[PDB]
Amino acid sequence: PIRALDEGDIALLKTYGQSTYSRQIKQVEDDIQQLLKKINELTGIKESDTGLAPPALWDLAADKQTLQSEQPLQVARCTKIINADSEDPKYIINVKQFAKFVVDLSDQVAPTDIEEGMRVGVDRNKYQIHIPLPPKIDPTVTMMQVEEKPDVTYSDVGGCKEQIEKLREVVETPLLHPERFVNLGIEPPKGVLLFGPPGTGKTLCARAVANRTDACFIRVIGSELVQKYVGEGARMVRELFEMARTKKACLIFFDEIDAIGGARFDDGAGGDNEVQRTMLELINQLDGFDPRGNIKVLMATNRPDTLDPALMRPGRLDRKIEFSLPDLEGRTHIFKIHARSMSVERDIRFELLARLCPNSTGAEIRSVCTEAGMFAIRARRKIATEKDFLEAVNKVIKSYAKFSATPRYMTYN
Amino acid sequence: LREELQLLQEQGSYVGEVVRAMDKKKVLVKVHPEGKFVVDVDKNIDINDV
Amino acid sequence: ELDIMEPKVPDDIYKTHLENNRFGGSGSQVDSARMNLASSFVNGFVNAAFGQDKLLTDDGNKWLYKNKDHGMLSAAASLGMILLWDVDGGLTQIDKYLYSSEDYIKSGALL
Amino acid sequence: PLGLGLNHLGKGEAIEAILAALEVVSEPFRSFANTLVDVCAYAGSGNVLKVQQLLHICSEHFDSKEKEEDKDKKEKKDKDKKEAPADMGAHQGVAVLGIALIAMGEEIGAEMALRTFGHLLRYGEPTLRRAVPLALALISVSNPRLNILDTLSKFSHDADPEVSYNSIFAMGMVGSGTNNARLAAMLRQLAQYHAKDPNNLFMVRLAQGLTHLGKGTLTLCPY
Amino acid sequence: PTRVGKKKKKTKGPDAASKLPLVTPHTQCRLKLLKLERIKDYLLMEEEFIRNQEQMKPLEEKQEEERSKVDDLRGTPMSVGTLEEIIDDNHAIVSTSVGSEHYVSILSFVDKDLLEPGCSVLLNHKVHAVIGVLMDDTDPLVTVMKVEKAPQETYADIGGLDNQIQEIKESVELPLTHPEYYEEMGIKPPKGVILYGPPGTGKTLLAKAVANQTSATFLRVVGSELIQKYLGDGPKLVRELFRVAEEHAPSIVFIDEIDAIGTKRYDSNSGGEREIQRTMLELLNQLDGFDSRGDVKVIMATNRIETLDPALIRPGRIDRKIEFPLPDEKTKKRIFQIHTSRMTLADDVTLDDLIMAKDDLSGADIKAICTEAGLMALRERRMKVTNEDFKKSKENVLYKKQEGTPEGLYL
């Protein structure tokens, strides 16, 4: 009692039910999708640009003064120099993508400005040094040494003023008053790392005093020190710490040092593939070239796993400044920050809100202020009410965070 | 046998993959272990090779 | 529609070009006389459906009596859009601005 | 010839073409009028057999500057018979005229074929409302650019005021110095001040109740 | 200046499908015979108009002397290179594909304004000089990940999810169609949205339905597309994918199952996990790149949320977290309404009975019941479907997972 379908039994299904419009509606839909294809290969519009110039100015350029750049001009490569020798060159040079070579200089130069760690012009066949070139100054530093005013007010990161007061004492007081250090007989600290929960004010307290420095400031991408090519990131961190120590009163901000970090004084450090090239070179140039400097460097990360005790050996890094949560008055200050710049009611109170935000960051406090506005968009409103924020705190904190089972309450009132 | 032995004595052809490339008698080929090349066609084939 | 949104002259889509003068240093570089054709439409298009204007047509009234004969016809033609769908007092608005005895003024106004 | 077609608008009898075209049997610069009263009687329906003679007779021909007005006006009559099958052919109309016209055409496309979008709908939706600054932010200044700045002007031929101010005020900022203010400083602000005409009173689009015409067309189509 | 570089000179290429989504009889009716034959008429004519376009062009060109000689002044097998830095004295420093760096000249017809570090150029073989700059063209890997066809049906296809549909439409469609509301209060729109829940709930449906009804460029990336093995190919594609998303539209980037590319960041020194982790880090960086994102919306979707890196989940990066639960006994009525619409339903069935006896079957469970009950009618040789086919479909499909309950223990 299962039966399967014979060939005549197939024809019962396939016939019954609109046998006038079945294929009539179907092959029209079938060949139109064929026709969607047949337009597309028929169109095939795609064309090139290839970046030419208008022929008003290049026709005389396209004369023999292209061949004068073809055959007289050359195709010389660039490299780096390890070192030199005395009274005779015997220079040691890496292509580093090809091999390392022991070469000579060509006759067109003087042996003075062929110093170590320099870009030079290298012959294709005889590999002689043709022209010494600059280290490509300066997009390797000044493109992150922006020297530009950021749009962060001092009143934006209010509520954590004592952690600011730690950082205001460490950074500002030697850079503008190294006089009471002489009047008392002390020297300033020169190492501070930042760690703690994400979205706490790390980049804010960095950028607020980067706004209040009137001076050189450098922000450093953590993945920028990670490179594709082996032996390339160390060469970069060479060029950063050299040309930042040149001018005075500058700040460098390391950020997300998880990729370049890890305890190298402790059990691990079994790495050594282009991460340690960056790492061993920076800890080389962090001390050694810094007794009694002028440029302070700050690190910041979300993971306190990657603390190096060799960094925390004094001379490199001294102080563990971490950030915390606001008690209440810090939070009520922050709610006033993220709600003064939007269409609100003049009668809401914010101390009721920070009661409902026990363990929360200003990232979450900002998220509530945006979410409460989103409830005002749901209805036709243009100003927020009290209950707009009250639904937002319920939507943010009492939904995904560490409190559930609200109806079974009945033990506490 | 002479026709074989002469075509044997010949440096072989490369192979490069094109999913798509631009028109106007020149296409854009990355080959196997290398970069991309703007090349020219032969005249026994079309520009409709894509 | 005076209830829902509108007092008699918004006149400020022109004023919404306020932030441009700080975009790139300074402003006050545009003095083209053919822009003054478009200056009729800050009064022109917004005053449809009873945007009646005594002395808010003074930007018209000066430029009507300043130059631009085809703009004399145009600013006179804008008054019909100011009193649109009207039979009650529409011609009385024209008659005070009608008798200037000019070709371009009356041919714009009576159109 | 336009008031002729306005005197014979809206009937697919094809006697009015037998009337008018056999009446003005004449030289081809007067047979520019052949396409007018033909399709002015053809306001809106499905008569796709007319739409292929609206293409196949004067399609391209490369036409070194003799009848280039006629292929524009033949395209002008393609704009209607498209604005009321109720979006059945409006998707097909924007599919054709975006492709084989401005993205595959000449004096037909890059001078005139944007007046479809100033005539097909004027509600505004970001498919075609962003398809026009594809050919406007690229002004293509090599031509007498007020052809493309004519397509600037009635790009803002869409009523019911919107957020399109972002497109217009930014193009007015690049339209002050460049896109010189001798010619179109009226025009950009004519376009700018037209979307917010009043707050209200934007229904000029020949569709009442659900789909009937209410002409209407006789006042719009002259411009 | 005020309008420096006029913002990259760049247009957007949106979708080309949704040719006519009005087939609204949805049945064997002469309207759909009339509707589709209209669509056949406009596509045949657009074929024949472009067929006459490449036909009636008598041009027979002769190239200009300047253009013809420069095409012979350049090499015939031109090679693609990469700018690194620029010296304006008509010779600069570029890089090959292998990274060999050359002090080559640049010819004086290259339109010397497009030279920015990172732009792609064309090179010679003899002196390797910069023949001409290439426009910003990308690899074929990312061009596959750009959607051509609007896939499937609109919001009427899904069986009642409207609490969450109204969420995503506020975050994606409303800021594009109508960004007047946000400037009325000075509130920036949300940036990233994560869709999570038990599987078979409709996470992929809502991605397809948004990609149906949109004017944005919709990018389809699925998880382990993005992982390769040439030591830099991982973090290279993220930069290329979001460059494409930046230069094109206010855009939607849908990355699916990001749990395969993100979990809690361990850093074993072996060179297998780093390529994951370096790519994992830079995506989170390129997310908050903040240079000019230009309204690029990111939609992410997994099943489990607990095994995620908390650096992704935090606000500042991703603002919306959306649960898709096993719904109710109410929207089930709509899914059984939808998935039984195109079939000859017999008048003996009470589909409420199936919703009544059960509590935790999903939308993919319902669609499997609707197909299996139709197969049972073919077994006993029918077209209409009795109540008994749904009884046998419910028993056959469901009993494969249900294990573990304390019966008798409770009451």
Ligand SMILES: Nc1ncnc2c1ncn2[C@@H]1O[C@H](COP(=O)(O)OP(=O)(O)OP(=O)(O)O)[C@@H](O)[C@H]1O
């Ligand atoms: N203490 C605070 N005071 C004021 N605003 C805050 C505070 N903490 C967070 N915010 C809000 O959060 C954002 C700052 O987050 P922050 O830059 O500290 O993240 P982060 O520490 O860089 O995160 P991660 O370490 O994961 O990169 C600001 O936009 C601000 O609106």
Ligand SMILES: Nc1ncnc2c1ncn2[C@@H]1O[C@H](COP(=O)(O)OP(=O)(O)OP(=O)(O)O)[C@@H](O)[C@H]1O
């Ligand atoms: N609420 C619903 N309404 C209608 N159909 C649904 C619904 N939920 C699921 N389906 C059906 O289930 C199928 C699969 O759903 P979908 O894959 O989008 O769920 P998912 O959460 O993405 O599952 P996964 O994460 O395992 O891919 C869809 O093709 C759809 O037909």
Ligand SMILES: [Mg+2]
């Ligand atoms: Mg940060």
Ligand SMILES: [Mg+2]
């Ligand atoms: Mg899925």
